[PDB]
Nucleic acid binder design. Structure first.
Ligand SMILES: Cc1cn([C@H]2C[C@H](O)[C@@H](COP(=O)(O)OP(=O)(O)OP(=O)(O)O)O2)c(=O)[nH]c1=O
Ligand SMILES: *[C@@H]1O[C@@H]2Oc3cc(OC)c4c5c(c(=O)oc4c3[C@@H]2[C@H]1O)C(=O)CC5
Ligand SMILES: [Ca+2]
Ligand SMILES: [Ca+2]
Ligand SMILES: [Ca+2]
Length: 342
DNA sequence: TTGAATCCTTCCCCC
DNA sequence: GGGGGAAGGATTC
């Protein structure tokens, strides 16, 4: 049938800060985003493996990370740059099979189904690709290879970092039963729990229960996706994809409810969101507000025409007025999301 | 100074 | 009953 190749860049942001300043290598590096809330306020975007050995990983507040590795290099995240270094690497890949996906700023799938005859020749295209990326951009990436996207990615997860691994149909059969289901692409612990207290702890356990008992627990989508993976009928194609939305959320010094105190933050967001749109006209706008207790509340409005900057400002303030009206908590983070492009 | 994509469940129109 | 679709959430990486 087919052979899907998965490329995923190792500790990407951290590594981009490394390549851009070689001195950092071998030393713990932690890329984080400081919110002016107070000093060291913020979380950790990511950390190279040095720091990651000792517990410092993406998500933990940076204060907790500084109590663990008070002498690691902490750097502010610069998205724009990573973005370009990604785009660059995402082209060297187009040169191995126009059938490319691109799941994120660091993940992409290739259907080298035609450029290769056997897995063995795949392991070769794998090293070729790794090698070309390492020479041209100085970045280390892991490669996964199998019969379909899901497993191609599982291969990469098993070979991180700077790894290469193929999973043939014998491993798949094996993994269908032995591979812990919580380690399957698309099963956040929230779904890993509903599955746990339902009998399904392995990919194969999904065949046991009735289909409409799943459809009512985890939804139809997750249910069909899982069964097809369990029965070995998963065969999703590698489809190119486009950004279906652009936004920006900002943290405020203090939590408040005063429209006049939040407005300016909301504009900064609206202002940057349009810079990101570049040459695109959106038709729907959303204002998301992160409550004082870290809960998300949003409000939208779709127009029959595009949204000009002036109407985004105006329409954004009403939606906000509607959020405070329908909620009681104080706002912490505020932002906008522009979708449904022209 | 941090995204963004699916999927879902609910609601409202109307043939 | 069923096709449409907009919306405010739920979930995942
Ligand atoms: C998890 C996470 C990722 N990111 C971004 C930064 C990273 O470079 C990239 C996410 O990490 P991942 O791309 O999922 O994995 P990684 O390769 O960078 O990590 P690993 O060392 O396991 O190989 O996405 C954030 O900004 N915040 C987060 O909380
Ligand atoms: C949404 O707000 C934070 O900002 C980001 C940005 C990410 O990538 C650019 C990101 C990723 C992941 C994640 O779990 O969170 C974020 C976040 C935070 C979210 O709370 C991933 O698994 C991959 C990228
Ligand atoms: Ca990744
Ligand atoms: Ca990665
Ligand atoms: Ca998981």
């Amino acid at each position: 049938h087919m052979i899907v190749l998965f490329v995923d860049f190792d500790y990407f942001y951290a590594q981009v800060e490394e390549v851009l300043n070689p001195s950092l290598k071998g030393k713990p590096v932690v890329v984080c985003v400081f919110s002016g809330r107070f000093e060291d306020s913020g979380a950790v975007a990511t950390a190279n493996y040095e720091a990651r050995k000792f517990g410092v990983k993406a998500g933990i507040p940076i204060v907790e990370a500084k109590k663990i590795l008070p002498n690691a290099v902490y750097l502010p995240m610069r998205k724009e740059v990573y973005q370009q270094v990604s785009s660059r690497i995402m082209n060297l890949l187009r040169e191995y099979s126009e059938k490319i996906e691109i799941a994120s700023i660091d993940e992409a799938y290739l259907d080298i189904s035609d450029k290769v005859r056997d897995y063995r020749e795949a392991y070769n295209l794998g090293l070729e690709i790794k090698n070309k990326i390492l020479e041209k951009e100085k970045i280390t990436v892991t490669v996964g290879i199998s019969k379909n996207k899901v497993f191609a990615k599982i291969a990469a997860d098993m070979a991180k970092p700077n790894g290469i691994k193929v999973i043939d149909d014998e491993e798949v059969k094996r993994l269908i039963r032995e591979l812990d289901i919580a380690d399957v692409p698309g099963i956040g612990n929230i779904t890993a729990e509903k599955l746990k207290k339902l009998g399904i702890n392995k990919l194969v356990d999904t065949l046991s229960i009735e289909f409409d008992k799943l459809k009512g627990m985890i939804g139809e989508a997750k249910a069909k996706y899982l069964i097809s993976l369990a029965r070995d009928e998963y065969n999703e194609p590698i489809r190119t994809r486009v950004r279906k939305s652009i936004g920006r959320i900002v943290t405020m010094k203090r939590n408040s409810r005063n429209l006049e105190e939040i407005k300016p933050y909301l504009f900064r967001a609206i202002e940057e969101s349009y810079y990101k749109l570049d040459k695109r006209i959106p038709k729907a706008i959303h204002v998301v507000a992160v409550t004082e207790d870290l809960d998300i509340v949003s409000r939208g409005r779709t127009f029959p025409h595009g949204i000009s900057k002036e109407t985004a400002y105006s329409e954004s303030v009403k939606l906000l007025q509607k959020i405070l009206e329908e909620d009681e908590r104080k706002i912490r983070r505020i932002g906008v999301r522009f979708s449904k492009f022209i």
